[PDB]
Every structure is written in C-alpha cells, then in structure tokens.
C-alpha cells in the first residue's frame, strides 16, 4: 500500500472466554540469505561420516521457515499456570497467521566499515505448503521456534531435508525438491501476508493425574466371588501335592481378578543421579535401548510412555526415557547434569509400567513331578486386549503437534515426544529473500519483519467432587535474587524449570 | 464394501531420517557416563542431539512390528549344511498343531545392499522381495532392537538383550504387503481383530 | 473457618463499618432463625421431649475475575505431594474430620 504506512499492528495477549482460550503472539524476525541463493547437496561424508548409524543424504535450501510448534511460543508462564491448575484438558481449534511490516536491507562492505541501508524495491517470497508436498521437518523438535519472551528478536532457521540413502550415496528412489516450483506470494515493504488454518479433530490432551491405580480399583470391604489357587502342597515332605482354593478378598489384593491391565513397556536402562552409584564403564550408547531400521540402529528416545521411576525412588531415571531440556546458557557438548532439566513422568505410574522395570513374569515351561515351575521376565510387552495407558505429558517448553506419517497403518498415532498427532498439521511456511544480482554475484541483503500467530484452544473443565484440596502449580513464597520466569540484571530471560500439565486429579 | 486404497508407492524417506539436517534439537541426550581412564571416574555428561549425531535424536514415531524369520542365501555354499526348513522355521501353534508362519507380518525382505538373502517363509514364492517397505518396516531377518535386561549398579554392568519379536506399540507406523497375486480375503467373523488387511496381500472384507 | 458477616450496630455514625474479625458488614444481615420445642404438659411438669430434622441452606456468591497481565506465575494454595499418615481435610481412622490449617483468601496479586 505504501512505504510510509504500517501494514499491521502488534498483537500479544490471551483472552480467557468460557471454555476457550485465544492466545496471540507477535515477534520480530530477521531472515538472512542462506547458501548464497543455492541448493546444495549435503551428506555425512562431507563432514567425514565416521558412523553408519549417522549416515545421511539430502539437500539444504536457500529458504527459511517459521516455527511456532512449542508451547511457550503461545503461553506466558502465568497463562500456563492458569491453564493447568483449572482444566482437565485442552486442544487447539483454529490457527491464524500474519506476516507484515516487511523491511529489506542491503549491506555494503567498503574497506573495513560496513554500511546498511533500505532497499525499497526488494521482495520477499513466502508460501505455505497446504498440500503437504514437501518433507515435513516441523515435528522433529528442532531449534529456531519463536522465542518464549516477546521482547526477543529471533533468526529464522534454514530449511533442509533428507531423503533415502545407502551410506552417503543416494539411490534411484531418492527425491529432490525445488521449492521454487511452488507458487509463492511476493512481498515488498508495503505488502503483508496472512492465512488461516483449522486444526483437525484431535482428542483433548489429558492434563490430570489419576487418583486411583489400576490394581486398586476394587471395593476394599467386600470379597470377590472368584477363587484362586492358594496351596499346591499340604506341607513339607514327600507326595504332599494338593489343590487348595481361597476367596480373593481384601486381605490378599494381589491375586484378585481384574478387568484391565497396564499398558505396554519397552524396558530402559536405569541411571542414577548420584554418580558413584552408577557403574564405572561407558554405557551411554552400549547399554541403550534401540530400534534397528534397514541396518541402522536408532536410540529409542523417548520411546513408549512409561513412568520414570517407582514410588520413593526420585534419583533413578530412564537413560533415554525422559525429555531433557537445557537451562538458559547451557553449552552444546558434554555439559554437567546440573546444566540440564530432566523431566520425569512419575504421574503416569497408576496406569503405566515403570520404564526401568520388567512388565512382569510369564511361565516358561510345563511343570510336572520331575520339573519345577519356571518363570521368566518380560522385558518388552506389546499391546494386549484390555490394556489402558496414559500418553506422555506436554511441557511449557515442549512440542505441540507432530505430523502422523503417511502409511498404510498406525496404532495410537499420538506422538511419542508429547502433543497432538495430526494427519494434516499446521502447514509449513517457507520464506526467502529474492536474489538481487549485482549469475553468482549478488547484492548482500537481508530482511526483517514482525510475525504474529493466533491460536484458539478449547478447554475441558474440571468437574470433580473431591473434598480435599488439589495439588497446584505455585511460585515459591520466599526471597531470592531473581524472579523466576523473568529477566536478570543483564536482561536475559530464563525458564528455571520444566512445567508439566498434570496437577488436578481424576478417578481411574 | 468400503476399503482403504492399496498403497502403490515407495516412501522416499525413512522413518529415522524425518529431521531437518541443518538444525539442532532443543533436547539433550546422555553422551558420557565416565570421564575417562580407570577407577572412580563416573559422571553424567549431556549433549545436544543434532545433525552430527542423528541416531540419538528424539523421534515421534517408531517402526512397525516384527516376528523374526530365518535368513536364507540364494548362494547355496553360504547356507548351513543341514536340514533346517522345518526345524529352523518360524511357526505359530494352535490347539497343539504348528503352522508355519507364511508369509507372516509384512517386513523388509533384506537390508539395503544385500540382495542375496531372503526370509525363509517371509516372501511369497510363485521369490518376491518386499525391500520397498524397508523405510517404515524392520527387516524380516533382523532383530527389532535391544532392551535393557537389568538394573546396572556400581557392581553390575549394563546388560542388553535382543528383541526377536515385537508386538504393536503406540506410535508405530508400518506398510502392508504389496500386491502382485490375490486380491481380496474374507475377514474371519470374530469378537476382535487388528488391522484386518490380509497377510498375503490385498483387501480384507467382512463380506 | 472464619465468620462471614456481622451486623453493623444501629448508631448515629460509623466509619468504614467493615467488621474487625473479617467479613461483610451489613445493616440488615441474614436474619436470626429461632426454634424451640413446644411444651407438652404431662404447670411445671412436662413430657421429656426433643426433636431432630434436616436443615438446608443455599447462598449465591458473585465473583470478581482476575484480569492480570503479570508474566510470571502466581502463588497458589496447594496440597503437599509427600506421603503422610492421613489426608489433609479428611477423616482419620476413628472417623474424625479435622481442618489442619487456617486458609486465607489472599494468593493472587494486584498492583497498588
């Protein structure tokens, strides 16, 4: 519309209306030029490719992309508290995206001094992939999402993708994608971009912890009419075989007949927070639970949703079972355990097996006069009819959605890092600076803009008849040098700890 | 009656490569359990999972179920010199009678790069190969993976074990078997079934 | 555990009539409800007599919602997770109901 007229306003807030929440976030972004406007084949052998499990092949593109797929993008810490203390469930409904106040700059290096000025005739290209024809990289829990704190200015990440490989070489089936082969809206400094999205129907994430356990669902005052086998012998001696039977009742609750059993397990190695307790050997990769695909071993991370530890065992944690977040200012490589935040899903213990324990025992033979009864441990157990389980919890720092891979079949598609699985998730939003030739010679150029995303969330209210008060998320009462979830003296925003969604309770 | 379209395509991506190769994850993994050298060097070191190490990254979805087949080479000098067609076969027992597992759950016939091996009862023989599905499905002749068998401690080293068969887990995806062959099958009339698509390929139907 | 209302004494003047033990001061509070057993003579001689009945009360409360723009999380009233012999605000083994601590109403914050 014009060079001197703003193309949009700043919208950040939350509107709590009945059973719905509407969150709006606006950020300032900066997009560089990636790969000098080139598509470049990338693989492992360029970086040396020493390991076959790490072997890859693919392409890096000049395009960038916008990622809002973490929860602290849309929620302040207070809005997250307001959510998790009062509500049994939530889920996204509508999405509204806007890109505006575009500014393109040109950079000139004359001797040592750089100089930056406006280039008013330059364009930025942006499109969304709403037919899902590009490789979808948003469900991989990558960095580069909108910053949690609204005053931070962030850099747009570079888009890239992987295709089939054998070693570092390609195969005939590998695909190459030119993102220029997609129609894209072009924008000068007066244009803006917007689109709206409708989330497909998903179940409400359960932000509650059960107040009962799967094996205690019985009435403690009443016997069952079922019987169990109490004694196979009358006493010590020879030829003492017998069959005795007893009523299953309040006194022995382990043997009662039950309608439902805990969910599946894939056992994890158990690591202790106190270092001396752990074995003196390198078992981080060697003792790890993995899965193999086409001859490449991938770590099982985080894997099936399982309780992190038994009741009363806070120190132990599954080796790859939990999501581990970095604290603000944490290094990249070989940081100490006090630099990271290890989330623990102990609230799902009621319906789910412990991650570091066997699922149970089975009989391994036929007993007889000459053979004792033998059992063996179930290290992994797939789905059985009659199982019930809870999914993994979502965190303020964690992912929101994933894309359900397009396949013949799936079971319980809910993604394993947490969040809402979708066949048609929010589409990818690709962006680049249009090359301006000074043809391998170009004007050094970058752009900057404001991006605002609005999401409508549906709430499931807490109906409970519980008499006594709930557990709630609360801030610490006592004095401290800094306020949690605020800036420090240098102006750095930090998130002190991971915050889960499960506080309120339900009956099982 | 209404049935799902048979898939007649091969995935161009593998289930473990779905990531953006240029960007780190915000998730950490446990890189080192020992500082180095000898006695009393225990630590916990963590690193960002990223492009340099793609094996340890967190993933939302895992490959489908497996029931292992014995591997048989088309070169006869490679195969063991003994009769293992029945003895070394994967089977399922019903009412005391053993049925060979044929063709079985849909799995990749062989790893990439080995075309001379095939599952003993894994592939239909008119010898077809399922290698197209190696992207989302485990290899028929391989273990599904590893699990821990113990609690490690200062006394006990960490022990793993091979998963020979794996049932359905939440978050699995898989491809069905390809059609060449039969077209449809009748779904047995039962209280329950899972993913009724028939194992020799084609369209399962209650009618 | 505290009181709800008080009756503002009937006087020429008062200042900030809000009652000092807490709660809502009112010139016409909820009225007193008096009850007795009618004497049945067997006159100082009567039949020894008592009554028992169900009583139900219902109050409608109006709420003022929290509008705050505070970024960081509030202090909240919460139960403690750690294990204990009894549940707080529940019965014990003999069936006695207890209220473990006095709970005030001031947790959320405002600007002055």
């Amino acid at each position, epitope marked *: 519309d014009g060079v001197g007229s703003s193309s949009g306003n700043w919208h950040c807030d939350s509107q709590w209306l009945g059973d719905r929440v509407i969150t709006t976030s606006t950020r300032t972004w900066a997009l560089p030029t990636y790969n000098n406007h080139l598509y470049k084949q990338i693989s492992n052998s360029t970086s040396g490719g020493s390991s076959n499990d790490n072997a890859y092949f693919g392409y890096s593109t000049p395009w960038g992309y916008f990622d809002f797929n973490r929860f602290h993008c849309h929620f302040s810490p207070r809005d997250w508290q307001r959510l998790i203390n009062n509500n049994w469930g939530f889920r996204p409904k509508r999405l509204n995206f806007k890109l505006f106040n575009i500014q393109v700059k040109e950079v000139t290096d004359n001797n040592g001094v750089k100089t930056i000025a406006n280039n008013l005739t330059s364009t930025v290209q942006v499109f969304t992939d709403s037919d899902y024809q590009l490789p979808y990289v948003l469900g991989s829990a990558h960095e580069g999402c909108l910053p949690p704190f609204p005053a931070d200015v962030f850099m747009i990440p570079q888009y890239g993708y992987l295709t089939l490989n054998d070693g570092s070489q390609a195969v005939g089936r590998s695909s190459f994608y030119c993102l220029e082969y997609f129609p894209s809206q072009m924008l000068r400094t007066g244009n803006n971009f917007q689109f709206s999205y409708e989330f497909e129907n998903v179940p409400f994430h359960s932000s509650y912890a059960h107040s009962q356990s799967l094996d205690r669902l019985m009435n403690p005052l009443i016997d069952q009419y079922l019987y169990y086998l109490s004694k196979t012998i009358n006493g010590s001696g020879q030829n003492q075989q017998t069959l005795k039977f007893s009523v299953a009742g309040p006194s022995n609750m382990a043997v009662q007949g039950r309608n439902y059993i805990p969910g599946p397990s894939y056992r994890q190695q158990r690591v202790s*927070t*106190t*270092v*001396t*307790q752990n074995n003196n050997s390198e078992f981080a990769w060697p003792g790890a639970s993995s899965w193999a695909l086409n001859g490449r071993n991938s770590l099982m991370n985080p894997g099936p949703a399982m309780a992190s530890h038994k009741e*009363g*065992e*806070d*120190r132990f*944690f599954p080796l790859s079972g939990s999501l581990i977040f970095g604290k603000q200012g944490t290094g990249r490589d070989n940081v100490d*355990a*006090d630099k990271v*935040m*290890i*989330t*623990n899903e102990e609230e799902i213990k009621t319906t789910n097996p412990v991650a570091t324990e066997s699922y149970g025992q089975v009989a391994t033979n036929h007993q007889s006069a000459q053979a004792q009864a033998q059992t063996g441990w179930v290290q992994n157990q797939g789905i059985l009819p009659g199982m019930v389980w809870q999914d993994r919890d979502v*965190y303020l720092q964690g992912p929101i959605w994933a894309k359900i891979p397009h396949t013949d079949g799936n079971f319980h598609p809910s993604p394993l890092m947490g969040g809402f699985g979708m066949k048609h998730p929010p589409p990818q939003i690709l962006i680049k600076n249009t090359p301006v030739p000074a043809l391998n010679s170009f004007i050094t150029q970058y752009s900057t803009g404001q991006v605002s995303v609005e999401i409508e969330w549906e709430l499931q209210k807490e109906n409970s008849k519980r008499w006594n008060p709930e557990i709630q*998320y609360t801030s*610490n*009462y*006592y*004095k401290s040098n800094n306020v949690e979830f605020a800036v420090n003296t240098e102006g750095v925003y930090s998130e*002190p*700890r*991971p*915050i*889960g969604t499960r506080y309120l309770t339900r009956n099982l | 009656e209404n049935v799902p379209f048979h898939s007649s395509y091969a995935h161009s991506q593998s289930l473990d490569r779905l990531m953006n190769p240029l960007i780190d994850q915000y998730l950490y993994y446990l890189s080192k359990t020992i*500082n180095g050298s000898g*006695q*009393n*060097q225990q*630590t916990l070191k963590f690193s960002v999972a990223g492009p340099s190490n793609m094996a340890v990254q967190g993933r939302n979805y895992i490959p489908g179920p497996s029931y292992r087949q014995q591997r048989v080479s088309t070169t006869v000098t490679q195969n063991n010199n003994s009769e293992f067609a029945w003895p070394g076969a994967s089977s399922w027992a019903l009412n005391g009678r053993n049925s060979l597992m044929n063709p079985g759950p849909a799995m990749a016939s062989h790893k990439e790069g080995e075309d001379r091996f095939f599952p003993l009862s894994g592939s239909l023989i008119f010898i077809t190969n399922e290698e197209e599905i190696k992207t989302t499905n485990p290899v028929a002749t391989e273990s599904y993976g590893q699990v821990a068998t113990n609690h490690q401690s200062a006394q006990a080293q960490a022990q793993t074990g091979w998963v020979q068969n794996q049932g359905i887990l939440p978050g699995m995806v898989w491809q069905d078997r390809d059609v060449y062959g039969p077209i449809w099958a009748k779904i047995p009339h039962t209280d329950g079934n899972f993913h009724p698509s028939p194992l020799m390929g084609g369209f399962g139907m209650k009618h | 555990q505290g009181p709800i209302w008080a009756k503002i004494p009937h006087t020429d003047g008062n200042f900030h009539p809000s009652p000092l033990m807490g709660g809502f001061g009112m010139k016409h509070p909820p009225p007193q409800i008096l009850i007795k057993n009618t004497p049945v003579p067997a006159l100082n001689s009567f039949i020894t007599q008592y009554s028992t009945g169900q009583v139900s009360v219902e109050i409608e409360w109006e709420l003022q919602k929290e509008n705050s723009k505070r970024w960081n999380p509030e202090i909240q009233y919460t139960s*403690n*997770y*750690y*294990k*204990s012999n009894n549940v*707080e605000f529940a019965v014990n083994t003999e069936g006695v109901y207890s209220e*473990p*601590r006095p709970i005030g109403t001031r947790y959320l914050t405002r600007n002055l």
Partner: antibody
Amino acid sequence: EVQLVESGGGLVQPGGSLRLSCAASGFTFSNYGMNWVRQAPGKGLEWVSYISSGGTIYYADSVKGRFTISRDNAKNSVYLQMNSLRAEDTAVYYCARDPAYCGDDCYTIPAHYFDYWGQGTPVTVS
Amino acid sequence: DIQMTQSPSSLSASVGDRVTITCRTSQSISRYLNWYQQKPGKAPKLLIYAASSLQSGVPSRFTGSGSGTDFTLTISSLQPEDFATYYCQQSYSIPPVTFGQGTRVD
C-alpha cells in the same frame, strides 16, 4: 531468613532411645533434602543420615540399623529417632540443609554439601 | 569411604598474611570438594563449594582450586574474624559424605 533450630537431646542411659527434631523456617521445607551431622566433643565433623524431598534415605555405616530419619512437611520438621544409643553417640547433632532443588516436573541433582545448619543440640550417653 | 587428610593440621599466622590449606583424598573425587569454617562453639558455615566456587555472603578473600586428589583453600588478606578450624568434605562418593580431620588457624 533460613533458620534451622533443633530440639531434643540431653542425657540418656546407654541402650536408651532419643528423638531429635529440627524445625525449619524461611524456606519451603518440602523442596529440600535434610541432613544430620554430628561432632563428638573434641572431635571432627561426621555425617549421620540423609533424607531427600522424595524420601531417599541414607545412613552412615556406624549408625545403620539403629537411628531412623523421617520428615513431616506439615510441621516443617525432620526427625532423627535414635535407638540403642551407645557411648560413642555422644556428640552435638546438627541439622543441615541440602541446597539442591529443581522442581516438581524434573529430577533434582543432589548437591550433598550443606549451606545452612542448625545451632546443634548436645546428646550425652552415660 | 574416601579418606581425607588436610596437610597442615595446625597453622599459625598474623593479620594480612596469606594462608594456604590443602587436603588430599585417597581416590579421585573429581571437582567435588567443599570447605567449611567452624568457630569454637558455633555451627560450621559453608565457605567454598564444588572445589573452586564460592558461597553467597562470604568474603572475597577466600579462594579454592584443585581437581582429582589435590585441593587447596587459600585465605588472602587474613583478618581478625577468620581464625577458625577449617574442614574439607567431598560430595562425590555418596553415601557417605566424608569430612577432613580439621585444621586450626592461630
């Protein structure tokens, strides 16, 4: 500020039993692990027992099987129940806080160093 | 149980002097060494934690260095206030935490 004040102590006959309490103020007590250490008269510092926020419990070897540690978070107190007291148990027992605390949703990495202590109580076995 | 020995069991010094206390451990405890001072009759106070760090609210003169088996506590610009017994403890092998015998400053 953060304060630890422990009670109990005083004379007890060998083979006797004593219960030390430590009342905490100035911090959220349920978030932190608590320690008992003791100093024998004319002797060095020695660690006795530990209890974490989630109830991990350690004892020293010399003391194991006899003392038992527990905490009551409603009273903001940690307790040391000392049974089968011996003449080597004569000391000044201290209550010491472990500073490590991450939060409800993540594991805490125990520091096992004590920032705040009590004034101590004497225990004399004779 | 890791054994710890502070080398100068007793130390005599005057105000302003540079004092240095070291302890050695039988087996490596990595960087986990903590220093306490105790005045007679008082409870000890944490000075230095994690070998080289410093506790909040304690004078800048105190310093610490070391790794593995050797750690040193160095008081600089000694004053009237800090004549005390000093203790070194390791938070590495747990249980149980071990303490040094103690060093007196005169």
